[PDB]
């Protein structure tokens, strides 16, 4: 997260850490007590998922859980066209007991609203190229479809939306993939892709447009 700050601790209790040999590589979002949503480009054959975190040291995080998952389902049209349909569902081996620090979030039914200010959180790179010790939060504002397509055609697809590109140089960055973009109290997007360096003025990042997938998500979770 570029030009953010430390999150208020446990203010994003849906945040999931996807770790590989004790190192974060992606985030995800708890959307049901047994399911984590993430970007399909974060796919692995198995996962170690941290819930209830702030720092990434579970042994210093009361209320946290490190849980295993084997099963994940990538959207069937992931990467056709290239970069599009970038979501997957991970089924936890067991349902988690939700608490004030581990809680699911509802997914937006309605499309993003151009201009609206949203929140993105993650443990990815800072403006100084270092990794943070605690979860970071930043606001970014949704860009119109007209601006997103002008910047990103021929790779813009409506499974995507753009946010950021302000004078404020606020953005997501590497290691933030799969984490949440929250708009008006609901999960609106997942961190997907963008340009490097991150935080360029006039260059918004690209997010998975989850309003397009609410039927696929509900059917996958119920099957």
């Amino acid at each position: 997260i570029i030009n953010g700050e430390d999150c208020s601790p446990h203010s994003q209790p849906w945040q999931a850490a996807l770790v590989m040999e004790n190192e974060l590589f992606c985030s995800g979002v708890l959307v049901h007590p047994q399911w984590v949503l993430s970007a399909a480009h974060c796919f692995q054959n198995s996962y170690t998922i941290g819930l209830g975190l702030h720092s990434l040291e579970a042994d210093q995080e009361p209320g946290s859980q490190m849980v295993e998952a084997s099963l994940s389902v990538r959207h069937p049209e992931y990467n056709r066209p290239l970069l599009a349909n970038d979501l997957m569902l991970i089924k936890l081996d067991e349902s988690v007991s939700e608490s004030d620090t581990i809680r699911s979030i509802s997914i937006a039914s309605q499309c993003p609203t151009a201009g609206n200010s949203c929140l993105v959180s993650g443990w990815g790179l800072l403006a100084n190229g270092r990794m943070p010790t605690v979860l970071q939060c930043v606001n970014v504002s949704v860009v119109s479809e007209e601006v997103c397509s002008k910047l990103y055609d021929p790779l813009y697809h409506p499974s995507m939306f753009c946010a950021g590109g302000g004078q404020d140089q606020k953005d997501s960055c590497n290691g933030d993939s799969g984490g949440p973009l929250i708009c008006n109290g609901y999960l609106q997007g997942l961190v997907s892709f963008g340009k490097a360096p991150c935080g360029q003025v006039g260059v918004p990042g690209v997010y998975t447009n989850l309003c397009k997938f609410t039927e696929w998500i509900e059917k996958t979770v119920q099957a």
Binding site: F25, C26, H41, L83, L125, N174, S177, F193, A196
Partner: protein, 166 residues
């Protein structure tokens, strides 16, 4: 895919942040360099040069906001620092080499290469137009140089060494 590209220490290769040497598995005495091709006055072609070891380091870049590289990802490959796009690889028709690896100062959002497991290491595969069919990068011997070029079925196999010596 699930398969993460790893360096010679077994650590995931970073998305752009760190540089690496492409060390040929049976040509560790040689390393990547730039050379002249055709009638060009500036050296813009990539060769494996027996006088440079480990050679010019590269960075692997994907637009995805992940900090690791998978074999499935389309990549840009570039020489130089993260801040520079003057060393970006492309594949260009050039007689009599064929489809030669050359350096550009322009870069697409999504590059045309993938790094794929081969033997004891990895090969570089070029996907014209970012389609389904990949062409292996190998060596073409012309003008006393070993140019990196399309040589489908005869890849140059590399291991990937983090460039912590600089």
């Amino acid at each position: 895919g699930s398969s993460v590209v790893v360096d010679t220490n077994g650590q995931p290769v970073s998305n752009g942040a760190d540089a690496y040497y492409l060390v040929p598995v049976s040509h560790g005495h040689a390393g990547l360099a730039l050379a002249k091709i055709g009638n060009e006055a500036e050296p813009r072609a990539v060769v494996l040069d027996p006088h440079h070891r480990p050679g010019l380091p590269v960075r692997f870049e994907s637009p995805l906001r992940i900090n690791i590289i998978k074999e499935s990802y389309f990549l840009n490959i570039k020489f130089g620092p993260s801040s520079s796009d003057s060393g970006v690889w492309d594949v260009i028709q050039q007689d009599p080499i064929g489809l030669a690896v050359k350096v550009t100062d322009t870069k697409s959002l999504l590059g045309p290469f993938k790094v794929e497991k081969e033997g004891e290491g990895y090969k570089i595969v070029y996907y014209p137009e970012r389609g389904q069919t990949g062409l292996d990068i190998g060596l073409v011997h012309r003008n006393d140089k070993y140019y990196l070029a399309v040589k489908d079925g005869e890849p140059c196999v590399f291991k990937i060494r983090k460039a912590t010596d600089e």
